[PDB]
Amino acid sequence: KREHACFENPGLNLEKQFNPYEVVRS
Amino acid sequence: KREHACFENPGLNLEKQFNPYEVVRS
Amino acid sequence: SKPHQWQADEEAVRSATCSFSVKYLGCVEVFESRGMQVCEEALKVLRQSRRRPVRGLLHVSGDGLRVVDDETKGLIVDQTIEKVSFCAPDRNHERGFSYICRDTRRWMCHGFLACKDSGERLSHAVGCAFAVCLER
Amino acid sequence: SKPHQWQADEEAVRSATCSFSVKYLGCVEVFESRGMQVCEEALKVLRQSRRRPVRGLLHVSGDGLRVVDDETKGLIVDQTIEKVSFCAPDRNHERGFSYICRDTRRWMCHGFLACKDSGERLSHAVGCAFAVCLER
């Protein structure tokens, strides 16, 4: 058979946990 | 001043959680 | 423009009332995020193992893929859609179906035997969940 | 062939009886795993912030870097050595000291002001913990 009924997810997430001791850069 | 008292860790780990539903390849 | 059964299934996925009776065969690492052959080889591995298949219901929605064990009612698989990359039926088994998701940085293929549907019906349903994922 | 104080400190690190009084300034993301300038800029950021520094003891051993809060006795930092890549004193502050570790895939620099030691003494102690790490 040929390939059929196959689906890729366009919403697949390719791309941070909060640390109270962390200083954010500016 | 010049750099002094700096240390790199040669034991730094650069390089798996067990899943009871997982089948291992052979 | 879908087949009637698929258009109806899309309605059920979008209202979170879509489920299919399955045996969950487990999962196996795969080295690619997509590809029908990658899934078919994973399913071949899963069928070759001696581990007991688990009967349950596969619920498909934008909120996730949930596998609920028939015997225990335990929620034994709870998969967010945003981590699922690919799904496919099986040219070697009319009721086979699998999906590939993130494991960490690895890929895992989760394999199923549908009890009374074709694998391609399950695949289309999961593909509808992908659509909802992209919408959110 | 080390200075006497450093040879003694190495003994204390290896028997897990090495600790230093510090203020813990917190941590900031860094974009490189090593480099004295990377640490010195992190410490500059940490000193510029308004967050309260936490007084405690920094315990150094092969089992980890542990920061125990003086006021509460709470174990507020517990860092395995195998995730620490680099440590350095500070040319801008005689008592400044910091280390870089894994955050996930990111790097974080944890900054300290030693209460009654030079930063380079702390740096050497942590470097001894590196030695033990490689031995294990």
Residue numbers in the entry:
A (entry chain B), B (entry chain B): 131 to 145, 149 to 159
C (entry chain A), D (entry chain A): 64 to 166, 169 to 201
Article, verbatim:
As the first identified cell fate determinant, Numb transiently forms a basal crescent during mitosis, preferentially segregates to the basal GMC daughter, and then promotes its differentiation to neurons/glia by antagonizing Notch signaling. During NB division, Pon together with Numb is basally localized and is segregated into the basal daughter cell. We found that Numb PTB specifically recognizes the AB motif repeats of its adaptor Pon in a previously unrecognized manner. The multivalent interaction between Numb and Pon can lead to LLPS of the complex, forming condensed, autonomously assembled membrane-lacking compartments both in vitro and in living cells.
Several repeating motifs have been found in Pon1-228: type A “FxNxx[F/L]” motif and type B “NP[F/Y]E[V/I]xR” motif. Proper combination of both motifs dramatically increased the interaction with Numb PTB, whereas the isolated one barely bound to it. For example, Pon fragments containing either B1A2, A2B2, or A3B3 showed significantly enhanced binding avidity to PTB compared with the isolated A or B motifs. To elucidate how combination of A and B motifs can strengthen Pon’s binding to Numb PTB, we solved the crystal structures of Numb PTB in complex with Pon A2B2 or Pon B1A2 peptides. The complex structures revealed that either Pon A2B2 or Pon B1A2 binding led PTB to form a symmetric dimer-of-dimers in either a “head-to-head” or “tail-to-tail” organization. Pon binding could also induce Numb dimerization in solution. Despite of the distinct domain arrangement in the two complexes, the A or B motifs from B1A2 and A2B2 occupied the identical sites on PTB. For example, the bulky aromatic ring of Tyr154B2 (same as Phe120B1) inserts into a hydrophobic pocket formed by the side chains of Tyr87, Val117, and Ile139 from PTB. The side chain of Arg158B2 (same as Arg124B1) forms hydrogen bonds with the backbone carbonyl oxygen of Glu92PTB. By analyzing all the PTB or PTB/ligand structures deposited in the Protein Data Bank, we further found that the newly identified B motif-binding hydrophobic pocket on the Drosophila Numb PTB appears to be present in most of other PTB domains.
